[PDB]
Design a protein around this ligand. Structure first.
Ligand code: FMN
Length: 350
């Protein structure tokens, strides 16, 4: 098995084991609606065995950065249909990454200056909010009421139904990188004393409920979950990160989702640790190249290998890797925001 070998992923037969990782690009149109430029971009990358979209908010409440697309409105459904059609016209597979930023936002990004919501009224210790005006200090978020938790689950349920209507092949639940679900999981960011805080089971409960709701919409073989055991991004810490992720990964084996997507870490909490704990398909991401991607597949510790930055600058990464060709350099300055430049103008091979 290598990067070029076919693989089964839930209800699909993919032609290779290379995944385009989810990548926020901040290039949405009016009302956070995807646009023709975004469809071009994903279409250029269809040689990935599977594309995961940029994180996509399930509500205005759940947005935390400028110009990110949503999946809550009919207009957004119709914008994403541009993307699904473009990808499917070229025979590719695409899953939409369902997002809620939780506390990683700012009143200036919120309608009417509402506080961001979170498991607890605890600001991130580190970093700054990314507002339309520039960076600003985070404010303390508002703790969700217990009777608000159903509403959160419904945002994910409706966003999953909207993705389905838009023509995606599936969805990925973003439970990584210090966003709302991950803020629930960590006991440094979750100090609740209802059934969504306290024990590890309780801190994992919102993720389990969201996953159950999303599976009911799509079928489990069209649903993935992404987590970050060694992920501290978003000022998210926990006393026993291992045990916490050891039960969360063991609780996802009862949902039988298409895959579990892990951000790799040095911390023990790699795919080598989780392989005997998870019982499905594993996608591994973070810092891979061609050599290291083949290696992790050779080791048996992961089934697919996701690539982020190299997919930004190499739309035909799989062919470049096959032919041992040189890659285009990536320009970090145009990762987040802007126009076609550093987005759709990186060339495939001649
Ligand atoms: C510009 C950029 C945007 C990203 N946005 C997302 C996102 O929307 N959702 C997510 O789960 N991770 C996001 N990530 C993390 C990547 O999915 C991925 O794990 C990382 O890029 C893989 O490492 P690599 O770039 O070394 O391949 C982002 C990373 C970068 C550099």
């Amino acid at each position: 098995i290598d990067l070029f070998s076919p693989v089964r992923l839930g209800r699909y037969e993919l032609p290779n084991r290379m995944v385009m990782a989810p990548l926020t690009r901040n290039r949405a149109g009016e009302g956070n609606v995807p646009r023709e430029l975004n469809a071009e971009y994903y279409a250029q990358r269809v040689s990935a065995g599977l594309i995961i979209t940029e994180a996509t908010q399930v509500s205005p409440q759940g947005l935390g950065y400028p110009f990110t697309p949503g999946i809550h409105s009919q207009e957004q459904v119709e914008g994403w249909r541009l993307v699904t059609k473009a990808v499917h016209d070229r025979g590719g597979k695409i899953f939409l990454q369902l997002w809620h930023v939780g506390r990683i936002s700012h009143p200036d990004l919120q309608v009417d200056g509402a506080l961001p919501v979170a498991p607890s009224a605890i600001a991130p210790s580190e970093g700054m909010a990314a507002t339309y005006e520039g960076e600003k200090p985070y404010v303390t978020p508002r703790a969700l009421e217990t009777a608000e938790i159903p509403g959160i689950v419904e945002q994910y349920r409706q966003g999953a139904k909207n993705a389905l209507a838009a023509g995606f092949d599936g969805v990925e639940i973003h439970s990584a990188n210090g966003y709302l679900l991950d803020q629930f999981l960590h006991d440094g960011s979750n100090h609740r004393t209802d059934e969504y805080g306290g024990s590890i089971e309780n801190r994992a409960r919102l993720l389990m409920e969201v996953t159950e709701a999303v599976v009911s919409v799509w079928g489990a073989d069209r649903v993935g979950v992404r987590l970050s055991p060694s992920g501290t991004f978003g000022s998210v810490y926990d006393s026993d990160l291992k045990a916490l992720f050891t039960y969360v990964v063991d609780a996802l084996n009862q949902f039988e989702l298409a895959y579990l997507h892990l951000v790799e870490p040095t911390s023990e909490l790699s795919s080598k640790y989780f392989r005997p704990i998870y019982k499905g398909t594993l996608i591994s991401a973070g810092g891979y190249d061609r050599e290291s991607g083949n290696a992790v597949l050779a080791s048996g510790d992961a089934d697919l290998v996701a690539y982020g930055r190299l997919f930004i600058s190499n739309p035909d990464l799989p062919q470049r890797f096959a032919l041992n060709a040189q890659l285009n350099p990536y320009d970090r300055s145009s990762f987040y925001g802007g126009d076609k430049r550093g987005y759709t103008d990186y060339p495939s091979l001649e």
